[PDB]
Amino acid sequence: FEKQQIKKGRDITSARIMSRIIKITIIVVLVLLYGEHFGMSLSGLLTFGGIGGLAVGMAGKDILSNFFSGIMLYFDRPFSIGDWIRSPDRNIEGTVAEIGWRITKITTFDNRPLYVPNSLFSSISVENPGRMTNRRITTTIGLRYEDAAKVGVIVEAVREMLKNHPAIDQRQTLLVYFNQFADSSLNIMVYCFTKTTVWAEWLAAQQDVYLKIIDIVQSHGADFAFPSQTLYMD
């Protein structure tokens, strides 16, 4: 009757084979249990079942791990639905769309589905940026070695701008500091946080910040740096 229920939406070949499989599986168990109720070589039957179930376990490890981790997700909620996810250790990055017992159905940002097994979440670090608070801005202003005299005041101006920018969160960090030399340039870091979590508003603020930086730089007399070389002709 199970086979007939399987027959509506599947094939005869596979349903027949699956019938054979489940039939063998169900007869073998009761033969193993009542083979000594018949009284026929108990410990041989014991060995038979032992090695069979032993290989079966070594195989189905892969699947039961998925199932048990599905349970842990059912109770432990590292993420939920709609929560943008990623992992540094693997490509998972997408919005969750569905949880399952074996797997999860994520939608990437390609609008593609991704069917992930749940064993992975018990071995791997998971990042849920959808829960986050603020969004980061990071740059390196690459000036020239000619413009070294102008660095302190550029830096102070940039800082004073960010500190008086509406979109920016001043309770969080706010760092503008000449942090390294570099081949062909002097690199000023910028490290700031916007009080939005929205993609577009973050990007718009990033935009305004960058354009104001440009205006500041080119005002003070400096200019950005391309790569550079010294050619000793012959």
Task: Give the footprint of ligand PEE on this chain (CB under 6 A).
Answer: 17, 21, 55-56, 60, 63-64, 67-68, 71, 75-76, 100-102
Considering the complex, state which of residue 118 and residue 166 has its C-beta at the smaller distance from a copy of itself.
Answer: 118
Q: DSSP code of 233?
A: -
119 Cα distance to chain centroid? 15
Angstrom distance (rounded) from CA 219 to CA 41: 96
* Of residues 174-203, those binding a copy of itself (CB under 8 A): 175, 177-181, 183-184, 189, 193, 199-200, 203
Considering the complex, state which of residue 60 and residue 152 has its C-beta at the smaller distance from ligand PEE.
Answer: 60
Angstrom distance (rounded) from CA 106 to CA 144: 46
Task: Decide: is 33 part of the binding site for a copy of itself (CB under 8 A).
Answer: yes
Q: Give the contacts of 216 (CB within 8 A, at least 6 positions apart).
A: 154, 157, 158, 161
Residue 32 contacts which entry, a copy of itself, ligand PEE, none (Cβ below 5-8 A, type-dependent)? a copy of itself
Residue 3's nearest CA partner among 12, 29, 25 is 12
Residue 111 contacts which entry, a copy of itself, ligand PEE, none (Cβ below 5-8 A, type-dependent)? a copy of itself
Residue 94's nearest CA partner among 104, 103, 213, 102 is 104
Closest distance of CB 6 from a copy of itself, Å: 9
Considering the complex, state which of residue 77 and residue 136 has its C-beta at the smaller distance from ligand PEE.
Answer: 77
Task: Decide: is 95 part of the binding site for a copy of itself (CB under 8 A).
Answer: no
